[PDB]
Design a protein around this ligand. Structure first.
Ligand code: PNT
Ligand code: CA
Length: 223
């Protein structure tokens, strides 16, 4: 997260860190045994780390639970990142508490201008690299589809939306991938892609979760 702020320990209790020996992606806990992340976060041997703030320090609120199953979206296209969404089932149910909480799925999409909370342990530098140990947060509005598609001509699908600031300076970044974009208490976005980070006219691109709710619920119900 570039241009964001320290969330504060466990203030984003649905934020998970996906770990395969190191943090490599965010995810969002959607119920006690399911995390949603970006399909581009897919790998085998994922451990989901719940209740994290400092991902480098055991602070006492963590639950580390291995993934039992990863389900990448049937239509995920890694070339275009269309349908950049994946479900990860936990081997055992997270113990839900103040610090480890699920985030509700949308029952509909969100409008441009809606303010969202984007969070993650991704790079905090627009130029160069600095990875935070504590969770970073960014409030960002959903951008118009036109501004999104203008920013990334030929690349934005109905399954993506942009959020952030065309002026630059505030964005998600690498390492935030798969993490949540929560707007009005709903997971509306997943950190998916963009160009650089927090660059002018290159806003973050997010998986449009509202398109996937049926798939998510059906998949979870059947798995
Ligand atoms: N659309 C495409 N064909 C495409 C775009 C990027 C990409 O790259 C590797 C996978 C994405 C890895 C995560 O990369 C980012 C980059 C920028 C931001 C941001 N600035 N918000 C957040 C995450 C692959 C395909
Ligand atoms: Ca920790």
């Amino acid at each position: 997260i570039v241009g964001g702020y320290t969330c504060g320990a466990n203030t984003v209790p649905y934020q998970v860190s996906l770990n395969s020996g190191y943090h490599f992606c965010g995810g969002s806990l959607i119920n006690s045994q399911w995390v949603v992340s970006a399909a581009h976060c897919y790998k085998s041997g994922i451990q989901v780390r719940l209740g994290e703030d400092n991902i480098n320090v055991v602070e006492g609120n963590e639950q580390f639970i291995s993934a039992s199953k990863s389900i990448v979206h049937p239509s995920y296209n890694s070339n275009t990142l269309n349908n950049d969404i994946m479900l990860i089932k936990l081997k055992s149910a997270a113990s839900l508490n103040s610090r480890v909480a699920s985030i509700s799925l949308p029952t509909s999409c969100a409008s441009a201008g809606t303010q969202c909370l984007i969070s993650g342990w991704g790079n905090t530098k627009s130029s160069g690299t600095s990875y935070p140990d504590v969770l970073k947060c960014l409030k960002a509005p959903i951008l118009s589809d036109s501004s999104c598609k203008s920013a990334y001509p030929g690349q934005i699908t109905s399954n993506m939306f942009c959020a952030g600031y065309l002026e630059g300076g505030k964005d998600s970044c690498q390492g935030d991938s798969g993490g949540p974009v929560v707007c009005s208490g709903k997971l509306q976005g997943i950190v998916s892609w963009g160009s650089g980070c927090a660059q002018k006219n290159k806003p973050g691109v997010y998986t449009k979760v509202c398109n996937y709710v049926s798939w998510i619920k059906q998949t979870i119900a059947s798995n």
